[PDB]
Amino acid sequence: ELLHAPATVCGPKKSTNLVKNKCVNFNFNGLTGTGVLTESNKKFLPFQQF
């Protein structure tokens, strides 16, 4: 069933190769948007995502 608690069983999710320096429609873990991807020098803490 599916009406007792929050979903803890999920189906597999596929992945696609990432591209750089090109205008694409990216989708990172449910984050959506449009733009170009390039390398950075930011110093994200280990527990931070975006």
Binding site: A5, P6, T8, L45, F47
Partner: peptide, 29 residues
């Protein structure tokens, strides 16, 4: 305990149980 320090997250458990009271297991806290 004088000063400032931020606390980083550790875990996130999807237990979903109602909690109203708690107790510790054992010299001061």
């Amino acid at each position: 305990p004088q000063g400032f320090s931020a606390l980083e997250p550790l875990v996130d458990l999807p237990i979903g149980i109602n909690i109203t009271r708690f107790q510790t297991l054992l010299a001061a806290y």
